[PDB]
Ligand binder design. Structure first.
Ligand SMILES: [Ca+2]
Ligand SMILES: [Ca+2]
Ligand SMILES: [Ca+2]
Ligand SMILES: [Ca+2]
Ligand code: NA
Ligand code: NA
Lengths: 994, 994
């Protein structure tokens, strides 16, 4: 259904044979999902610069190599000597091991795409539509919204698909189409036919357009077009394929991959040029062409092993999987590139109400006069858990929960905080939260009595709809409120003339319960209560209570202390004036003290951790608050941003003081601020700009229309769930919680994937470094080349493949969020790490030929033992009076080859353990942190073992099984990759950081 | 232990710490078997001329082909188009299907060597040696006789290993060393030290030498040397490796294999030259080098399939396995080449006593006067089964067995043939046969009474040692022999004065039982017996009995008729002269008739079949007999060599009449003779020579010393078991039975393997013929080449491999021994068969592209249907207004390729059924004759099916699964290989033979 604008509210609906007040059937939803695809853009090709120069380069290596194996193969049939078996075997295995690589490489890749599919269950839904399944509007992915369904559209919403305006439901229907038509003034629409078919978006003021914003109103409609069929999609088609927007890492990796097109080809082509003096040896029949083919294999097969492969897909597995865990704890990050920015964001300019604080008012502590003797008193405090109007909370004592019932005062305390309350609690069947029924400061008195559950009403098996008011609606049936003296500036307090419920007696148990502010009330409290008795309010006692009330408003808490009181013997109502607020000061004097609570707007759950944890990781946090300069600061000292005692009157800000200062002060002050109180709605952008002009990376949260401007500008703009969709469009991350903490749970994750990437390669590079110098070293001095092409391929399958895959399945390093951030322009390899790269290589390659040389040279319980010169070994037949009871041929045997190639594989395995944590010890991050690695190891052990102790199998790779006595030398020479690397950690972690 | 001649009977034995009267231990027998190998020559290399030019030629084809697949493979990475999958797959499969050939080829070969091992259980043993296991001499293979054991050595024996003469056991010890030292006079040895170490065989007249003959005597000794350590072995070392003695077939096969180095390379190199106009087509990207590589694969991969492979080992499996069955029924043929001569031997100059006849005398029929009325009589005959002195025989009546007891006459008949008998039967515990105890003509009277078992003694559970004389030793206790009138020329008869055993009465039951020749006795028979009574011997009755006696000596039987008689009332012994032979004619007159038997020297078991069966197969048989001219002929008319009535007095021979005739008569007469009576011991050679000068192939049997000269000269000299080892050396086949029949059971087998060889290839050639023209035909006319290299390899694995293997596991054709012999110079392929070769090919190749062409052309229930021109198909894009609703690309689809290649495989399978019998119909030799073929078929069906209906698998070979409707067309086009070939049989079998 195209251009449904030419068509009115009847000819439209009937197109898909469907009535607005019903929608489309599930079978139909299928067909349109099948015939029009999804409501999204096409799949862009992720062909990297590494994929061209490295991945496929290998895919040439493996083939020309093989080609060569069939060159020499073919000439074998023309050899006059002995009909061989092992040479004949080679090309078979050549092919049969390279296929094993494909059993690995493609499998890693499939898990990659499986992981991306996994994410497709968390991708944020912002599209309310009417369907046939439910008799009510349903949530659904924007892409998944087929063209035909009655898309619902409200204040601030983002229109996912091209909707023909069917029925206008608000009084007006305007649409901010600044994204396309272009104007910061929205436009009035209507629901009628636009007869002329050829026109511009402007003149179609009877339809929503996919990607436009809702400035105001609410309507309904029908989807004309989706995906590429979209109007903006036809414009966005230009930006789709033709582009050049690689991220910084995506420029490193490949400048890091293309430099290896130099290294690899260079070194290995040189591994040919170095063996020029071995192109007419008798091992190759003294043939000047049959040799050069073989030393074509040595270089190339060493290359294959040298080339790190599987990276493109591994970072997919890593990145994606990390975005899964980000998504799981409500860090909703769409664009995967957003992690690379998410992980270096060193600043978090976030919001307060709903993000740093729960909004929901909550009573902290509250106390009763515990003992009164000698005009002196001890107080009885009771902290309440939780922070919400949901009664999900429990009273305390010294951080030890106890039943308020055990204290008679609290049983009066709640009676005042349940009766003396012109407000209530409610549960929401549609939403599922507890929302206040009145004013929050008074809602907190509903909250509290419920939590305490003084008289212990049975609520464990009582309904949500009864729980929100379980205790209160019991307290209410024990007493009566006869008339309320409303809260009065005069006395900074309220009161209620109560009385015993279900009564027969007239003036026998009426209790004028007061409530409100400290002094105002305490100045009218002449008696003190203890348990169920009374005693004259004393000097030092008064001063104890009021000093402790001074305490909470003094301390970092800053709990709004609210005194509560009782008049014992109330006066006659007939006598009492009922209609003049100023009479109440005579009607509220001479009270009996009961208690004084401390209540506040608490912080959001697990922020108090997510505030210190980030300061450690080199993150500069800022609140964008609405409270006044003073009171905003009190909230930022309540949490942790400011400390109890630490002068900061240079750092707090309000709009007055912000537009005053000269441009530079507005910049200079901004690189050192924490709190933006009463901040005008345009300030947010100017801040960002300034913060950015300090190379600092922003993390703005948002919600109401006028946040997009900042969010779009910042690097990771965030949005609120209850915040509109205009903002979830302009953002990079959507806090599906609203919380500051969930942003942290995101930066901390997005960082983790960065540390796993820097290891997955650290293993490959360092390990494969040694492998090539493992031919240089021996070829330099004269030592034998204790390898053959297949053995060089063997090292590639064993080491580069599966343990590599397990390095991308790693937990978080201990020091995930203590270390400073990466400034995005800092390269992929650092000097000390670059040494650490070649250092680790230096050794794992030196151990390899070592183990081979140890056999010929200083052998234990073995044949030969020639500790003297092994360099000019090719002159052994020239001068034979040097050896002592051993043939010159001995060095062509598979015994040393076994050892070294066994040490080559053995040592790179524990090199992954090293690579488990970039900086934390094997004691600190043991091998069992990663079970997926400890599996990868044993596997290859089975495999590598398997090709030693299966008759024909070793014969294939030219090896020999080893006695117990010999597999011990493997440990003494392989373990040192632990001690070696572990020493590296000690230098970086202590001297280079910390 | 070398040169044990320098050492006497003490210093010798002690060498191996062993005492002559004990020998060597089983553990020692191990060690010497291990340290000195076997007592035989080395293993000669069977490297054929086909192995050089065909087997290994293929082993080059498969490699340069593969090489090519990695040439084009490598350039794929440099192709600008689309990243393919199926081309990338190819080289993998290339290697992976050629390996499948090796799963076949080598497996056929292993069964080959397993079969040869199987024969090593039947190889004839001629070496009696003293060992520790048994306290007596043991039989053992000559090769298996280690050096050390006390080798026993008798009259005529062949000394297997170098024996030091320890203890001379005969009165003299001579040794015929004509084979080495050289002299037809043997040499006296002794048992003492030959002090001078350097000397010639002659001067060591104290030792046996391996390969020399025993002229006379018997001794014992100790083995100095074995195998190459032998003296003749050191001389035979010259004849071992360096030689040139290929058999006629072995010259055909390879002149037949090297001609295919022309055919194969030629045709297939031409299959490249014909596609020169396809080296710049868009299918190959218009590239002038990328194409030529592919049409290198078409030719070569067609070659591979063309080359018949597995033949060298199959003929091993066939030949060997046939030699197994030859060995099983006692045709002991050593040299495997001896079959190739065994199968064309069209003459069988064999022996009589022990070979054509059982030697053992045997009574045929025998009769009683059944009725006597009116001077006339009817006779009651009783044929006896078997032919041996072993009582393994049963009486008959009209070829219906009945108990002689039911006839009273026979109960007297045996009484005369048990009592009147100066001879007996015996069993041999050491040998296990029944050997006579007296003269055979009289032994037959022991034999007979036992067989009859008249009075029915319980013998079913009586010992062998009691059975040989079970009845007789019962008859003997019913009567008494008082004195024997010995057999007398006078009366041509013997008699015994009997009497009732355990008697008290004197002249009351004495019975003078006579025995002997017809007339002599019957002329003294005045009474006749019937049942238990008497009646005067009559004229016509007498003449009935004597005419019937005239009958058996007249008929081809020629049974020595021997009349038996009884004197009822004997005269007084006191009166009777006891000491004058001439008195017995008065003492034997007036007898009572009882019966007259017919007895003879019967033929050997299953000769009467093996005489007619061979005359059919074009075999000219001759007896070398000792009987006189007349009586020798009677034996050769008794069997079948001569017919009842057929004048042959021109064809029978005796030595008198043989050395008389002039050389040419001795030649001219010899190409037409059957019986050589009283033949001087040198005649045998002169015969051979003459028979050979008629291009005829001899099959001389032998036994006594002076047979080797003939046997060595003849083509398949044979030997007797009981015949000495001098003869088992000079022979080519050893009759482990002695029988003429077992020679037949050998020629008939040795022939069978010849017919199986001529089919195993008939399948390959004919089938693979069509395959190559299957590219010529279509390339000639312009049709598409409905194949690709892998498909050409597929045909080679499916068809050439396993069904081929099953063609060598075939039963005997109905017409195994009716058809004439192959004269050894007649080639491997005959004109009509050569047509039949290309005829069958002509069609099985024409069916293949047919089925492909039927798809494009005249299709049923299929897409396309272009019955018009398909030749200039490459001009379809040039001129596109010709097609009707189909793309020009349609012809590159896998649909026709599937069909044809499916017909290519389908039709060659039933081509093996054809090949089951060279000339006998599917009705005559149904497919279920060979279960090993009917297995081979289903297998490949599973395989071929499997690569159509397994998603990726067909995609690999570029094929498509077929609907039921389509696998029906396969039958209608494949079955005709039956009807086609079956018509060939009808022409050859009837018009060209029969
Ligand atoms: Ca690699
Ligand atoms: Ca590696
Ligand atoms: Ca073949
Ligand atoms: Ca074939
Ligand atoms: Na942004
Ligand atoms: Na011979």
């Amino acid at each position: 259904m195209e251009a449904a604008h030419s068509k009115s509210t009847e000819e439209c609906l009937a197109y898909f044979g469907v009535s607005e007040t019903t929608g489309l059937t599930p079978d139909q939803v299928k067909r349109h999902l099948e015939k029009y695809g999804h409501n999204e853009l096409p799949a862009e090709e992720g062909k990297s610069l590494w994929e061209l120069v490295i991945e496929q380069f290998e895919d040439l290596l493996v083939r020309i190599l093989l080609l060569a194996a069939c060159i020499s193969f073919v000439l074998a049939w023309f050899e006059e000597g002995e009909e061989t078996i092992t040479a004949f075997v080679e090309p078979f295995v050549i092919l049969l091991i390279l296929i094993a690589n494909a059993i690995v490489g493609v499998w890693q890749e499939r898990n990659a795409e499986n992981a991306i599919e996994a994410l497709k269950e968390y991708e944020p839904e912002m599209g309310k539509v009417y369907r046939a399944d439910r008799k009510s509007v349903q949530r659904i992915k924007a892409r998944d919204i087929v063209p035909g369904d009655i898309v619902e559209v409200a204040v601030g919403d983002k229109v996912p698909a091209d909707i023909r305006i069917l029925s206008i439901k608000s009084t007006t229907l305007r649409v901010d189409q600044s994204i396309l038509t272009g104007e910061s003034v929205s436009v009035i629409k209507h629901t009628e036919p636009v007869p002329d078919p050829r026109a511009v978006n402007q003149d179609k003021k009877n339809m929503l357009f996919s990607g436009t914003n809702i400035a105001a109103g609410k309507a309904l409609g029908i989807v004309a077009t989706t995906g590429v069929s979209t109007e903006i999609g036809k414009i966005r088609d230009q930006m789709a394929a033709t582009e050049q927007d690689k991220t910084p890492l995506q420029q490193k990796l490949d400048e890091f991959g293309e430099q290896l097109s130099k290294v690899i080809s260079l070194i290995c082509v040189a591994v040919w040029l170095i063996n020029i003096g071995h192109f007419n040896d008798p091992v190759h029949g003294g043939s000047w062409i049959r040799g050069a083919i073989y030393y074509f294999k040595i270089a190339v097969a060493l290359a294959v092993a040298a080339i790190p492969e599987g990276l493109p897909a591994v970072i997919t597995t890593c990145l994606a999987l990390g975005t899964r865990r980000m998504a799981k704890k409500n860090a909703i990050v769409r664009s995967l590139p957003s992690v690379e920015t998410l992980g270096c964001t060193s600043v978090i300019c976030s919001d307060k109400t709903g993000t740093l604080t729960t909004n929901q008012m909550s009573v902290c502590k509250m106390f009763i006069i515990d003992k009164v003797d000698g005009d002196f008193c001890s107080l009885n405090e009771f902290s309440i858990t939780g922070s919400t109007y949901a009664p999900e909370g429990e009273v305390l004592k010294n951080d030890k929960p106890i039943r308020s019932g055990q204290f008679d005062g609290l049983v009066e305390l709640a009676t005042i905080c349940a009766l003396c309350n012109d407000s209530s609690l409610d549960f929401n069947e549609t939403k599922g939260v507890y929302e206040k029924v009145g004013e929050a400061t008074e809602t907190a008195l509903t909250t509290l009595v419920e939590k305490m559950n003084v008289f212990n009403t049975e609520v464990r098996n009582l309904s949500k709809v009864e729980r929100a008011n379980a205790c209160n609606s019991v307290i209410r049936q024990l007493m009566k409120k006869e008339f309320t003296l409303e809260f009065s500036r005069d006395r900074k307090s309220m009161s209620v003339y109560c009385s015993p419920a279900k009564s027969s007696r007239a003036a026998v148990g009426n209790k004028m319960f007061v409530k409100g502010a400290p002094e105002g009330v305490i100045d009218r409290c002449n008696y003190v209560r203890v348990g169920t008795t009374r005693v004259p309010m004393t000097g030092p006692v008064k001063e104890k209570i009021l000093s402790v009330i001074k305490e909470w408003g003094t301390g970092r808490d800053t709990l709004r202390c609210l005194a509560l009181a009782t008049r014992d013997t109330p006066p006659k109502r007939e006598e009492m004036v009922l209609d003049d607020s100023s009479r109440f000061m005579e009607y509220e004097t001479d009270l009996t003290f009961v208690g004084v609570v401390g209540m506040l707007d608490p912080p959001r759950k697990e922020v108090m951790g997510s505030i210190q944890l980030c300061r450690d990781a080199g993150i500069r946090v800022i609140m964008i608050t609405g409270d006044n300069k003073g009171t905003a600061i009190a909230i930022c000292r309540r949490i942790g941003i400011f400390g109890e005692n630490e002068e900061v009157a240079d750092r707090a800000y309000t709009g007055r003081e912000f537009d005053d200062l000269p441009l530079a002060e507005q910049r200079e002050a901004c690189r050192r601020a924490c709190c933006f109180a009463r901040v005008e709605p345009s300030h947010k952008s100017k801040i960002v700009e300034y913060l950015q002009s300090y190379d600092e990376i922003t993390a703005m949260t948002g919600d109401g229309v006028n946040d997009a401007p900042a969010l779009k500008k910042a690097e990771i703009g965030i949005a609120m769930g209850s915040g509109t969709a205009v903002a979830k469009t302009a953002s990079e991350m959507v806090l599906a919680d609203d919380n500051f903490s969930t942003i942290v749970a995101a930066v901390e994750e997005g960082r983790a994937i960065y540390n796993n990437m820097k290891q997955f390669i650290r293993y490959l590079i360092s390990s494969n470094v040694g492998e090539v110098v493992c031919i240089f070293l021996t070829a330099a001095l004269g030592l034998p080349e204790a390898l053959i092409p297949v053995q060089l391929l063997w090292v590639n399958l064993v080491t580069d493949g599966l343990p590599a895959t397990a390095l991308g399945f790693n937990p978080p390093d201990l020091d995930i969020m203590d270390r400073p951030p990466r400034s995005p322009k800092e390269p992929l390899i650092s000097g000390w790490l670059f040494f650490r790269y070649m250092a680790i290589g230096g050794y794992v390659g030196a151990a390899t030929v070592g183990a081979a040389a140890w056999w010929f040279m200083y052998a234990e319980d073995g044949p030969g033992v020639t500790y003297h010169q092994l360099t000019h070994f090719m002159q052994c037949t020239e001068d034979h009076p040097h050896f002592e009871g051993l043939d010159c041929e001995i060095f062509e045997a598979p015994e040393p080859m076994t050892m070294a190639l066994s040490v080559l594989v053995t040592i790179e395995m524990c090199n992954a353990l090293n690579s488990l944590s970039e900086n934390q010890s094997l004691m600190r991050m043991p091998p069992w942190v990663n079970i997926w690695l400890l599996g990868s190891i044993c596997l290859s052990m089975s495999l590598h073992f398997l090709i030693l102790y299966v008759d024909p199998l070793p014969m294939i790779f030219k090896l020999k099984a080893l006695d117990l006595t010999q597999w011990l030398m493997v440990l003494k020479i392989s373990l040192p990759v632990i001690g070696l690397d572990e020493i590296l950690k000690f230098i970086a972690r202590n001297y280079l950081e910390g």
